[PDB]
Symmetry: C4
């Protein structure tokens, strides 16, 4: 429970950093920066948005390496410690 | 066995939600909406389709976080509890 | 060892199916079809190639769900049962 | 600790190979080649860069299969043996 809260906060902070960075350096609207940060760290990578500056490319390399781990950690705990219990409870005959 | 059936249903429901959402808000043909939902949740992300509206971008963020876990859960069980047994049986000398 | 050989063969067969399908239905050159199949099943998804026909989109949905599991199974075993031993042996003082 | 250092070095070497290959065969600037190599091995795959030559497509297939395992191995150890301890220490009441 507290573990999920910590990953939640960590993920939020990571996404906030990405939103601030891409909106500033890559000139994206804040919503697009947040959306791009999520699409990046979850490894979907549509490419509708991508860094055009070298500063952006370098940050993206570091952002991915440092963010993928926590984002997927949060996703795992969300599905196993939150979603799983709910589906099971919806079964209880 | 029953576990696989539950993940199967859950995945179907998740994909149906995506199909309805993207066909309505993003104006995609139903087949393209389903295809896009799958390409998104499996993290392939070709980008041949991507949300153009803010409503679509926000939903996509939430859809990914909530759907990746179950989709990959189903994929895992499919390969370990269904595909694996079959390949092994095809070996039995 | 034999496990790695089985996953190797399974991966080859899966990629051959994709190569045949995309070169025929989507009209790609065989090399591009193989390349696209790999980029798809490893979830990279550049999007330089993507299915344009409904037949192709439907097959892609099924191909991903059935192929991701085995492809990543092979990748895991390759890194743990082949690459890992080699790096360790290159260390042995 | 030493495990993390080995994966660190291995990842560096893998990325250096990609940087050299794509800058030479695909004609990318070194920074773009490094960026593309990272985007590829972490499976993000934006597609802003992608191999245009057959030599590049073939290398990419092999690069992905051999590199994804080590890159994600490093990411895992980075998050579990480096990031995790730090966040926990930042909690210690
Ligand atoms: K991807
Ligand atoms: K991916
Ligand atoms: K992608
Ligand atoms: K494009
Ligand atoms: K893409």
């Amino acid at each position: 429970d507290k573990e999920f809260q910590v990953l939640f906060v960590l993920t939020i902070l990571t996404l906030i950093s990405g939103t601030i960075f891409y909106s500033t350096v890559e000139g994206l609207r804040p919503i697009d920066a947040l959306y791009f940060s999520v699409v990046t760290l979850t490894t979907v990578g549509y490419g509708d948005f991508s860094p055009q500056t070298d500063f952006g490319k370098i940050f993206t390399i570091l952002y991915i390496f440092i963010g993928i781990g926590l984002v997927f950690g949060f996703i795992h705990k969300l599905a196993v410690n939150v979603q799983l219990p709910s589906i099971l409870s919806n079964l209880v005959p």
